[PDB]
Amino acid sequence: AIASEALSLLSNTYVDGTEIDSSLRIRAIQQMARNLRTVLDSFERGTADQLLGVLLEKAPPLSLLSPINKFQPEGHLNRVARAALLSDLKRRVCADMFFMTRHAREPRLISAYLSDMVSCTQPSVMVSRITHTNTRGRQVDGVLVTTATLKRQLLQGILQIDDTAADVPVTYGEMVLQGTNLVTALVMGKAVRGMDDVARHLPVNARVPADLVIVGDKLVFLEALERRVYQATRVAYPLIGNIDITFIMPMGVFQANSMDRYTRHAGDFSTVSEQDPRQFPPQGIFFYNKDGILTQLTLRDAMGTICHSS
């Protein structure tokens, strides 16, 4: 935004004014240049933001994509192995809901969780073009975007650095749509990209400090974009996500008439009262809070649902 009381200043720039007048115009132009310069950086940052926007809503979770991809023979499942695969996914998802905290004392399993992570996908396309590479001429394969602490835990004793520099293309492609694919666009409603090429049938790199890490046997980019971009700007880092987990608990259920009301030993939890208070039907359940603070839940709390005209 170009503010008022400074556009009227920037307007009459050719009028014979004073010095205390002509000395505010330079301030106005400095402000306008600062803003126009810092706006064009917003698109170069928004590209790196939108790419994570697209490369996050397109990726299934690892705990489901890995065990499936070990079942490619018999592409059509025969309605029985599918049941077993389901009963195995339902038990393998609960294994590694957080596979870098529950298993933090032992770093070896994390490299396995990453090796089978990178070997689970498929390559896209080999275009006849120049591609990202390190100094020694080994072509790169993938990227591993994380948070800043995942980098600190991975570069410590698990993932081995290989090289600290890489060369990358520095100019985009181009499409012009002129010649015979313009006539085809105006007369009919179609066009082809390399049209002139079928009618014939019928680039500089730059070394830049990066971090290229070996995983499995491939060469991947390991970084954390939450410092170069996303800092000092109020746009939340998309790699920080929210997980939902539905709990349920039973309240006041009585064990039916069977041998299901025992005691492990003789005289456990014996009260001084002349009768046993455990025999009576229980009415409340007790769980732990977020901060480990014992709470209560008795039948009185369902008075909002069981005592209503519905």
Binding site: Q72, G75, H76, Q122, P123, S124, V125, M126, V127, S128, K190, V192, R193, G194, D197, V198, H201, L202
Partner: protein, 34 residues
């Protein structure tokens, strides 16, 4: 329905602008395209 076909010939093999190097059973993934 089915607007994509008819736009261009499906087997149009004019000049491949790349390789696939994927070699997977593609029919198992049919939700992703025509």
């Amino acid at each position: 329905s089915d607007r994509i076909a008819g736009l261009f010939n499906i087997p149009a093999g004019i000049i491949p602008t790349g390789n696939v190097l994927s070699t997977i059973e593609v029919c198992a993934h049919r939700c992703i395209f025509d």
